[PDB]
Amino acid sequence: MSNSAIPLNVVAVQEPRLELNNERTWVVVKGGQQVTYYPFPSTSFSSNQFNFICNPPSAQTVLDRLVFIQVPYDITFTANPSHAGITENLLQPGRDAFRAFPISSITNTLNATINGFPVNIELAQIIHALSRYHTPLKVKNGWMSMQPSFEDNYQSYRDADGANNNPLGVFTSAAGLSELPRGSYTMNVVTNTTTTARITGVLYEQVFLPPFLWDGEQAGGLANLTSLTFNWVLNNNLARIWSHSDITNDVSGNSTIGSMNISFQQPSMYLGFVTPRLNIPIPPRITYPYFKLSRYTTQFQNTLAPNASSTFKSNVVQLDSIPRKLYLFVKQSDNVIYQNLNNQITTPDVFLQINNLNLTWNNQQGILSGASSQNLYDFSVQNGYNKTWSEFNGVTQQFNGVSGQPTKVIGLEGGIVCLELGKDVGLRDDEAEGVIGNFNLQVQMTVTNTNQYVTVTPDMYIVAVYDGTLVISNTSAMASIGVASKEEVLNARITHGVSYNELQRIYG
Amino acid sequence: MSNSAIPLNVVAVQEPRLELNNERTWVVVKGGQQVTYYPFPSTSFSSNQFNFICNPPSAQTVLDRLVFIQVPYDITFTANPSHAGITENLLQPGRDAFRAFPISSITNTLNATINGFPVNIELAQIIHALSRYHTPLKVKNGWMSMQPSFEDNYQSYRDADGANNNPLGVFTSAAGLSELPRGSYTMNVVTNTTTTARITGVLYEQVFLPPFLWDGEQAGGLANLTSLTFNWVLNNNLARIWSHSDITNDVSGNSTIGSMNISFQQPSMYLGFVTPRLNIPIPPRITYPYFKLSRYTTQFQNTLAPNASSTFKSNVVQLDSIPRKLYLFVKQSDNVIYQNLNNQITTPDVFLQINNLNLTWNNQQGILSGASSQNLYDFSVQNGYNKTWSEFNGVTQQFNGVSGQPTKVIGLEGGIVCLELGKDVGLRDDEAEGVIGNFNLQVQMTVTNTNQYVTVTPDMYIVAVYDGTLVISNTSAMASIGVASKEEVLNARITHGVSYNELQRIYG
Amino acid sequence: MSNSAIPLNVVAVQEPRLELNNERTWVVVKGGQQVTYYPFPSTSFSSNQFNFICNPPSAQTVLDRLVFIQVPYDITFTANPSHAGITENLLQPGRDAFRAFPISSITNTLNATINGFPVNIELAQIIHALSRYHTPLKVKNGWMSMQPSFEDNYQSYRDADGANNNPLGVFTSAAGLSELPRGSYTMNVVTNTTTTARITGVLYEQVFLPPFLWDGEQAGGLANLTSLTFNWVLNNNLARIWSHSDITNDVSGNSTIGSMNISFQQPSMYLGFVTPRLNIPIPPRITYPYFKLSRYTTQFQNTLAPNASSTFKSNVVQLDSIPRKLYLFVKQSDNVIYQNLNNQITTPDVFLQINNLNLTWNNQQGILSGASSQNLYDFSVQNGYNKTWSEFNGVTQQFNGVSGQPTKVIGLEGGIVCLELGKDVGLRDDEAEGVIGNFNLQVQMTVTNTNQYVTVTPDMYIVAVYDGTLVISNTSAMASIGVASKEEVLNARITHGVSYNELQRIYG
Amino acid sequence: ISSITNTLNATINGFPVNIELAQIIHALSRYHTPLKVKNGWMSMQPSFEDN
Amino acid sequence: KVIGLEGGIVCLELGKDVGLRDDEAEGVIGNFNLQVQMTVTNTNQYVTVTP
């Protein structure tokens, strides 16, 4: 429309209803012959160690990225004296289920070696701050549906009680085409009575960690291996699997349930080896993207409650490279939850509300200090936060209508910030999303306890994900970081032939 | 960038905040004038079949893809002796609503002949299976909304009576921004008493056949039509359109309702014809994608009750050309559902849970034997299945809180597996998923009844969908399957853009 | 695929599981250093007008598009005679919340001025209909989640309690991962009794005006400006921020409140900035898309009630150019809703159901004539209406099952049709969206009130939205409308590439 | 124990082959054996046919 | 009766037992982070031991 300011080109476009003329080909979709599903039953498993050794049938077989283990289980709980108490059954229609995600929240460290090169991630802590963060609605009803997956939205189970979003509800009570409560996940009960409860079922869980994936869409698999494996080591306390609502217990029982003994029977993983058609060849040595989770947790004893405000800091921690992303959040500290059976079961995994976060990049301070805590949300949802602003900063007020009564406040499970490091910190140049090395950061954020009932010693976490490339050939598994010279990055050409939105898709 | 194993090419992108500067065009939309909508009233509508003879206004007019038929009805119920009593009214607050979607499940076949070549479908069997596979809540609240659209997520209505997701619940009782259960759908009740009822309203529904679409997205409307016609032939029973729950009926048990009488007033189709500008001209003979749904059914004498497992042999079936995809699902055998009015109204749509399937081909034998039933759900969901894994494979527990009642088991919906052919099944070399050859499959599949109340009699369905081109010209029309040749498909040149994921979306 | 009518060119694509080889390339994402958020507290804010004046820190900084204001507020209520009494509190558990969305709802005109040229929208009217129109479930839980954003679907708040989709309700009672009801929004309750209530929080509203945005995608920020300023003139009545339910209060007709007063404290904008990394140069003069939203309405003296039909003409409102979109809906008349406080606080914001809209275009009398109400809605969800159809045209019965008091109906929110103007209305030859000429338009549509409680008078709106390039360059804010020529459109070379499904994404 | 098995499943090398056994075992039992082979390996289970 | 008998003191030689990346050695510099989380059982019968 060469009438505006500086002139510009016009193209015409066709409405969807009628094009109708354009060279329309027909695309024959070919995938290699003889796709197969293997089922390796773990050999060597204990209550504390699952141990699969699973090799590919050949070189030339390209195994698929989505892996997942299934595992049959057997739990028994026995009522405690002196309560008491107690009239009623030991399991309750609203009070209990499994903790999402059962299998991971127990695993100390999952571990796997692609082709003789050891790649591992720590599952226990990282996973709950990993759940909140990249799944929309569509994906939550897709693959991730296999383990209990509903997230902890109430600050303490006791308050949620009977509610329509209550995490531990039955199958009824969750609207249509919506995320189910964890009570709805099937298990069959041999006996449930006062004094005793014995239940049994089957638990699925997808192996998390790169270069495998729990995103829906997927890319090309890892030909050409000769070796593969998996090893999960589990915490010895192993009672963390169950979740229970405080409502029943009263004061000084304190609670009915403890103790309980969980047991496993040999689990078995499921791999999918396709093999390509003879006519079309795959290359001899091939490359893949590969990320890597790293965590440092800092604990300071001081205890704020029920709702005081304070400030914290972390010891400086040097890094060897800019990491692609970074996650900051204050959790209810781990050390206090572990002692005692009562406590381990009946505390949801939630975060404190961040009044303000200020952090320093390397030898540089004051970053993000000025931005409103509500602003923290704005640029993080853009990262993909998927949770109503209301639950981030969580605390909500419902007022009751009867004279001589005070209104009651409800704690709501705060948020977790994340700031893609070229996106939301900005970088002096030339520095990239990968370049080595040696930058050092520390964080100092001010939090507020919102939980209405318990004093909470807190803690801070920082998860980074370094980025690099893992090249597999038979038989090698070279991996790098840095990958680009600090000079070569300063003058690489910006191409308009991609959409920054394309790089959101490669999680991560 | 060169620094890992093999050197890799370097490019740099702009963060989305500062994407300027790139040359930016002003795009002018040119979509031809005269989008109008005609309302053809049926001539020769009887009690048994409606018929519409509706021709385009002129040559030169593109008839758009979405079409739908509105139909005013009338129904009367009559409480039967001697089930009495018989207290309160026949229609209840949340006890009943239209079976969804109604006038499609009644129709025996709908057949539309585009331009002197007939394109026919058999809906009564096909519909429910097709229904699940391509809905993303956003799409199921779009066009899919017009006919009551909520499918039964319970094995028996009985148990679901107090429940938030109840498939036939009143408008109050749906979550905000979600699917609404069939009790929502509006219509005037002239009377409701004990001993009689009568209801009157106009209910829509689309033509579901290919071509024409229920999928939201849309593409090129079929020009240059010169003739069109639609025939609906509906089954005798009719009583099926209504649904209703177990609890209310009693003690024999025999329901309150039977018998009842439906009617139809003159109906009417509704379709629109955009017409191009003289400027931008359209080709004299053009080609459209054309799928063809075909279904094969077997019946087994043998019963299982009410949660005992069994195996089944799918009957043999020789095809001419590889089907693009195919859907197998066991379900409750029809004949039973038809005999007797109450029985006919009472029982839902749902299937039995597939414990494992093992299909064969023409000498590739046992394919898919070892893949866990869970593994089955996975590859299916990638083709779009769209429901939590918990409700596929549906059995769920609700544990009871009172001493010392047993805990009750709820069946849900048996799943339906779908396997795109090039994708999961693995073709022999050089023949893709369209080509003409003689191949015959069988699908032996073991499956369990999970519904607690009735003995199931089973039946197995296998719905295949073939892919071909249909050239509509002026004047004549022409479809041909197996459009590619085996020597051709062997060596066809391989392209990167656009990749497959985008490709599937044209449905399907 | 040579052998089906006209030979079709035939290429092969690769599956997902095996990309496997395709030239992959490491990509440095380099976006400039320095993203920071300055908050500008509004000097000279009062109770009735806010005034910000936000200056650029320096040249060379892009200003990030997404802007939002954050106001702290304070309200006190009072019980009146003589409805009382009246026991219980003023504030009820599920009977009252903010009107969604509160702060803008009150605003007469939100006006800004970029770089010395003033652009404004009239917010109070526009907002509520331009609210339904472009959000999915994914986006309403994204940004828009900062204000209360659940929309009024009930024709009166009377019926809404108690139900799990009632707009004004407690946070619990919303099913997992869905639009939260408006009573969720957090805010402190200083005191609550019979005769007195008082609340004090802080609430945000993202600024709804182009070029600035409020939906998902994110696009290039405006550089380079030297001045920027805003001015909201709040409507004077300023009791419309709150909302009530009618169920409470006397059969006599009198309300609980009473009166109330509102007061704001200091309020403050939050602008993003970032300074482009020194090496890459942003061009001196740049150009952005911009849309001018304008509205007109016509009043009517006679009234209809409670559910009978009527028809209306609209006067000839002459649009100066052809706008991109055009909206049209019949709203309950303002002249009445602003009187008597009680009337002002307690009515929702919804529409009378359109039965047939038959409008006259540029020299055509009778475009869209005989398309069924159903038929109109179809083609508007391709403009992303989003809300389910049964809510559009809203009427919904609800039978009870007790003897023998006849069943109740419920009014539901009526739709608001929208015709995209080059697409759905169909345009002259050689003329297109941008093209500027003087054209007369006057709608004529019939509407039936569905709400069964009150007499309604009808306003009618017609909100257009134009298209023009605006060329920022310090210091000038050059604007245009109608940049393509009546000639030029003729022979604009049809090109794709460019996808129409992408074009529905660049929306304002 | 053959008479009690509902089904015996045995997968080899990753491809599962199984035989139902409650009733299929008695058909196969009378059929192919002769005296000299009946009295060999098949001597371990109490294997004399009900006549 | 049960006797507590003195807990252990674990010592891992750093390069040898812990494992160490390419081009790093016993006296190279500098700046790596270290964090250790081990779990302990008290054995001493008589006294409550703060640790």
Side-chain angles (χ1 to χ4, degrees), chain B residues 328-493:
Chain B
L328 25 283
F329 62 103
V330 157
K331 89 144 199 160
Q332 208 282 44
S333 146
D334 292 345
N335 289 337
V336 73
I337 31 142
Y338 306 174
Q339 44 197 309
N340 268 27
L341 177 342
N342 134 317
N343 179 274
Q344 183 164 201
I345 98 202
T346 222
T347 158
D349 96 311
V350 355
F351 328 89
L352 282 56
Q353 70 164 223
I354 314 159
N355 290 349
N356 101 67
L357 86 91
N358 133 41
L359 101 140
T360 83
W361 228 15
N362 60 161
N363 196 248
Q364 194 90 0
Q365 218 278 213
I367 305 60
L368 277 99
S369 32
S372 172
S373 100
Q374 138 58 51
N375 191 314
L376 270 176
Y377 161 87
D378 257 5
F379 75 75
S380 141
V381 134
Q382 179 158 145
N383 302 337
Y385 172 64
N386 107 159
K387 259 62 104 21
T388 45
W389 145 262
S390 195
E391 100 128 288
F392 177 112
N393 113 118
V395 247
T396 68
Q397 161 256 248
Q398 160 170 325
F399 36 36
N400 152 295
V402 83
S403 329
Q405 271 68 102
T407 96
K408 130 278 346 285
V409 34
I410 310 297
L412 291 17
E413 147 179 8
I416 77 164
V417 171
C418 159
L419 47 153
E420 190 212 297
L421 264 77
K423 157 92 82 182
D424 145 282
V425 102
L427 272 357
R428 164 113 138 276
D429 162 0
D430 95 58
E431 81 303 314
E433 51 148 288
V435 311
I436 202 225
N438 228 73
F439 329 35
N440 49 305
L441 71 324
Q442 198 168 23
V443 182
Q444 186 274 78
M445 146 203 290
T446 102
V447 56
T448 216
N449 179 196
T450 71
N451 147 39
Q452 245 54 214
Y453 299 116
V454 298
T455 298
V456 83
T457 158
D459 152 296
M460 166 134 38
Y461 291 112
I462 303 154
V463 173
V465 350
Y466 312 90
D467 287 5
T469 214
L470 119 86
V471 151
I472 269 158
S473 93
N474 205 291
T475 275
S476 107
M478 226 349 102
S480 70
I481 52 155
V483 39
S485 40
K486 324 319 141 294
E487 50 86 27
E488 139 77 298
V489 163
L490 186 146
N491 71 137
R493 290 291 300 321

Side-chain angles (χ1 to χ4, degrees), chain C residues 34-95:
Chain C
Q34 291 317 33
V35 73
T36 111
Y37 306 87
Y38 311 90
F40 304 94
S42 115
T43 176
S44 69
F45 78 97
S46 151
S47 181
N48 273 352
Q49 150 137 2
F50 314 137
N51 265 319
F52 307 78
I53 198 288
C54 345
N55 281 333
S58 335
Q60 298 2 268
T61 354
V62 297
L63 166 242
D64 170 301
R65 288 267 202 78
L66 184 207
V67 179
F68 69 94
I69 186 190
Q70 159 223 324
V71 351
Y73 64 83
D74 181 330
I75 296 96
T76 111
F77 301 86
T78 166
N80 74 342
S82 343
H83 145 81
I86 209 344
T87 29
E88 84 182 15
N89 303 201
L90 261 35
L91 292 246
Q92 281 297 81
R95 273 68 159 335

Side-chain angles (χ1 to χ4, degrees), chain A residues 144-177:
Chain A
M144 198 141 285
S145 308
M146 63 184 66
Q147 344 81 313
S149 222
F150 196 27
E151 266 326 325
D152 274 299
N153 47 230
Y154 281 126
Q155 201 63 165
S156 67
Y157 299 110
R158 105 125 99 256
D159 253 321
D161 184 351
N164 289 181
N165 64 178
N166 149 48
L168 327 151
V170 198
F171 183 64
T172 100
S173 325
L177 221 334

Side-chain angles (χ1 to χ4, degrees), chain C residues 310-312 353-359 367-374 376 417 443-448:
Chain C
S310 341
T311 126
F312 309 106
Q353 84 165 173
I354 289 159
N355 267 16
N356 167 302
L357 121 65
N358 148 24
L359 69 91
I367 276 185
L368 264 146
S369 267
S372 172
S373 47
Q374 155 55 59
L376 261 140
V417 173
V443 72
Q444 182 271 94
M445 67 193 180
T446 102
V447 293
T448 300

Side-chain angles (χ1 to χ4, degrees), chain A residues 58-208:
Chain A
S58 269
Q60 301 334 281
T61 267
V62 29
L63 89 317
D64 64 1
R65 301 275 219 72
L66 170 176
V67 173
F68 73 85
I69 184 200
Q70 106 195 353
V71 42
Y73 63 80
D74 167 285
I75 287 78
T76 160
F77 334 65
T78 85
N80 74 318
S82 300
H83 223 14
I86 152 159
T87 116
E88 283 164 278
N89 287 187
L90 212 71
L91 297 341
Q92 224 63 287
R95 281 62 143 101
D96 45 23
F98 290 127
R99 224 71 131 346
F101 328 69
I103 279 305
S104 79
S105 203
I106 257 318
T107 263
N108 221 19
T109 43
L110 170 156
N111 182 309
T113 88
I114 285 88
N115 212 337
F117 163 66
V119 207
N120 93 270
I121 188 177
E122 317 216 7
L123 247 70
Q125 286 86 57
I126 298 177
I127 228 303
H128 271 72
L130 200 269
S131 154
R132 302 285 203 285
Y133 225 84
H134 217 290
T135 73
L137 174 278
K138 171 56 93 74
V139 156
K140 186 39 36 70
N141 279 351
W143 292 344
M144 198 141 285
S145 308
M146 63 184 66
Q147 344 81 313
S149 222
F150 196 27
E151 266 326 325
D152 274 299
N153 47 230
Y154 281 126
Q155 201 63 165
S156 67
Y157 299 110
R158 105 125 99 256
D159 253 321
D161 184 351
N164 289 181
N165 64 178
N166 149 48
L168 327 151
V170 198
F171 183 64
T172 100
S173 325
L177 221 334
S178 142
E179 293 177 350
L180 278 314
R182 293 183 307 203
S184 163
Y185 190 71
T186 151
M187 93 185 68
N188 107 28
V189 300
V190 24
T191 63
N192 165 138
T193 195
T194 164
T195 75
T196 268
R198 233 180 101 10
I199 87 107
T200 297
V202 197
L203 280 168
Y204 300 96
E205 200 232 17
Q206 28 202 186
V207 179
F208 289 105

Side-chain angles (χ1 to χ4, degrees), chain A residues 188-407:
Chain A
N188 107 28
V189 300
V190 24
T191 63
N192 165 138
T193 195
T194 164
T195 75
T196 268
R198 233 180 101 10
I199 87 107
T200 297
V202 197
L203 280 168
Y204 300 96
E205 200 232 17
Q206 28 202 186
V207 179
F208 289 105
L209 86 20
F212 309 102
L213 50 74
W214 59 101
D215 140 318
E217 8 272 276
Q218 89 190 325
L222 334 160
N224 35 107
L225 302 180
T226 81
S227 106
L228 219 242
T229 110
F230 294 68
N231 324 228
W232 317 51
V233 332
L234 326 182
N235 293 215
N236 83 267
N237 12 246
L238 192 40
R240 182 113 260 256
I241 294 181
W242 204 248
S243 82
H244 197 89
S245 186
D246 220 6
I247 258 199
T248 33
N249 78 164
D250 91 45
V251 76
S252 347
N254 233 147
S255 80
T256 99
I257 342 84
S259 85
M260 66 165 153
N261 359 113
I262 314 205
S263 187
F264 292 131
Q265 283 78 130
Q266 80 158 3
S268 79
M269 216 163 46
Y270 285 90
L271 277 265
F273 319 124
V274 82
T275 144
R277 290 181 193 182
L278 303 188
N279 166 325
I280 275 265
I282 54 99
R285 139 165 17 181
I286 194 269
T287 158
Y288 302 84
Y290 133 97
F291 312 78
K292 177 235 284 281
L293 293 279
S294 313
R295 124 191 139 188
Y296 326 91
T297 130
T298 114
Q299 349 141 176
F300 13 71
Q301 263 71 154
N302 47 359
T303 51
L304 68 177
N307 56 343
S309 165
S310 70
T311 194
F312 303 123
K313 37 220 69 267
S314 93
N315 320 91
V316 148
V317 30
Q318 305 224 141
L319 304 185
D320 34 24
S321 207
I322 336 264
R324 156 92 146 338
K325 272 146 51 49
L326 197 145
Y327 290 68
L328 332 95
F329 64 97
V330 171
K331 202 146 67 66
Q332 205 298 358
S333 164
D334 168 325
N335 275 336
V336 46
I337 67 96
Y338 277 5
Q339 84 300 46
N340 212 20
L341 191 351
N342 166 96
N343 237 109
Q344 244 165 155
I345 90 195
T346 147
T347 59
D349 7 16
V350 291
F351 318 90
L352 298 63
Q353 86 165 48
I354 310 151
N355 280 201
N356 133 18
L357 145 354
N358 142 7
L359 84 178
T360 117
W361 194 210
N362 71 156
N363 257 199
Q364 176 38 71
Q365 138 168 308
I367 262 84
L368 281 156
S369 67
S372 180
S373 74
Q374 117 63 53
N375 200 298
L376 283 167
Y377 178 75
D378 252 347
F379 66 58
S380 134
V381 37
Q382 193 280 162
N383 257 308
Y385 181 55
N386 97 276
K387 209 115 315 315
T388 34
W389 149 267
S390 194
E391 291 198 329
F392 193 108
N393 119 138
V395 37
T396 52
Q397 328 273 305
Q398 69 152 130
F399 19 56
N400 84 78
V402 80
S403 53
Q405 289 302 145
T407 91

Side-chain angles (χ1 to χ4, degrees), chain D residues 23-33:
Chain D
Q23 346 89 99
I24 296 181
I25 233 321
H26 289 295
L28 164 154
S29 104
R30 254 145 280 262
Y31 247 113
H32 212 293
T33 84

